[PDB]
Amino acid sequence: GNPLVYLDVDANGKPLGRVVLELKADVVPKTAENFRALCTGEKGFGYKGSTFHRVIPSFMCQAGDFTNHNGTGGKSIYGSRFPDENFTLKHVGPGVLSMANAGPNTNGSQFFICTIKTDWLDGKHVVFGHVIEGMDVVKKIESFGSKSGRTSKKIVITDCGQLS
Ligand SMILES: CC1=NN(c2cccc(S(N)(=O)=O)c2)C(=O)C1
């Protein structure tokens, strides 16, 4: 079946808990595979040790820039960027996992977890999974955001990997 992966998240060096994500490899296999491998770190790089650098309450929590830690960086397992696979899955509500980008066909490693329905991103960002467990952790992360996206605590993915 579809992969299950996890992110263990600290805020200011203390654990918040675990976010478990189902990756919809049946719908977006290339996008799911990228995220899966970045969680395990099996290509020699990935999300371990990186941050949620942009968090906006009542919108989303963004992470995945493991090269520049500020929204400008990241890379995929395929190369620096890869195409929009499809827009079949929609930003239906809280817990949606979707790719951040800088316009069409600029997926790398950055991603966000929605804390509300973000319908205006449908057709612009590739949705590829959702939160199975740990929305409480996501709400904690969200609470450390701001309108500007600047976080008020340092939010770090201390560990990540694949459960199945
Ligand atoms: C304003 C900011 N926008 N971003 C940013 C960086 C990568 C992707 C995206 S996006 N187009 O929301 O998925 C936003 C920042 O990091 C700060």
Q: What is the SS3 string spanning the chain?
A: CCCEEEEEEEECCEEEEEEEEEECCCCCHHHHHHHHHHHHCCCCCCCCCCEEEEEECCCEEEECCCCCCCCCCCCCCCCCCECCCCCCCCCCCCCEEEECCCCCCCECCCEEEECCCCHHHCCCCCEEEEEEECHHHHHHHHHCCCCCCCCCCCEEEEEEEECC
Q: Bridge partners of 27? A: none
Nearest to 63 by CA among 22, 106, 104, 114: 114
The sheet carrying 4-11 orders its strands as 52-56, 60-63, 111-114, 96-99, 127-133, 14-23, 4-11, 155-162
Evaluate: CB of 101 within 6 angstroms of ligand 1: yes
Provide the annotated active-site residues.
54, 59, 62, 101, 112, 121, 125
Say if ligand 1 is within 6 A of residue 50 CB: no
Structure tokens belonging to residue 43: 């290509």
The residues with which 21 forms a beta bridge, in sequence order, are: 5, 131
Here the CATH number for the domain that contains residue 94 is 2.40.100.10
CA-nearest residue for atom 2, ligand 1, is 71
Number of domains in the chain: 1
CA 130 to centroid of chain Cα atoms: 10
Q: Whose CA is nearest to atom 16 of ligand 1?
A: 71
**Cα 51 to averaged position of ligand 1 atoms, centre (Å):** 14
Confirm if 12 and 142 have CB atoms less than 8 A apart: no
Q: In the block, which residue shows the tokens 């899966």?
A: 36
What determination technique applies here? X-ray
CB 20 within 8 A of CB 5: yes
Output the residue whose Cα is nearest ligand 1's atom 15: 71
Pick the closest to residue 84 from 140, 143, 32, 126 (CA basis).
126
Taking CA atoms, 61 is separated from 44, 78, 107, 111, in Å, by 25, 24, 17, 8
Q: How many CB atoms within 10 Å of residue 55?
A: 28
- Give the count of alpha carbons within 13 A of 22, CB side only: 11
- With b for 16 or more beta-carbon neighbours within 10 A and e for fewer, the 22-41 pattern comes to bbbbebbebbbbbbbbbbeb
User: Counting beta carbons within 10 angstroms of the beta carbon of residue 4, is it exposed (0 to 12), middle (13 to 18) or buried (19 or more)?
Assistant: middle
Which residue, chain included where needed, has tokens 């319908």?
119
d(CA 52, CA 141): 8
**What residue numbers bound the domain in which 141 lies?**
1-164
Close Cβ partners of 8 (under 8 Å, ≥ 6 residues apart): 15, 17, 18, 157, 158, 159, 160
Burial category of 68 from C-beta neighbours within 10 Å (exposed 0-12, middle 13-18, buried 19 and up):
exposed
Measured in angstroms, the resolution is 1.4
Tell the residue number behind the tokens 């675990």, with chain if given.
18
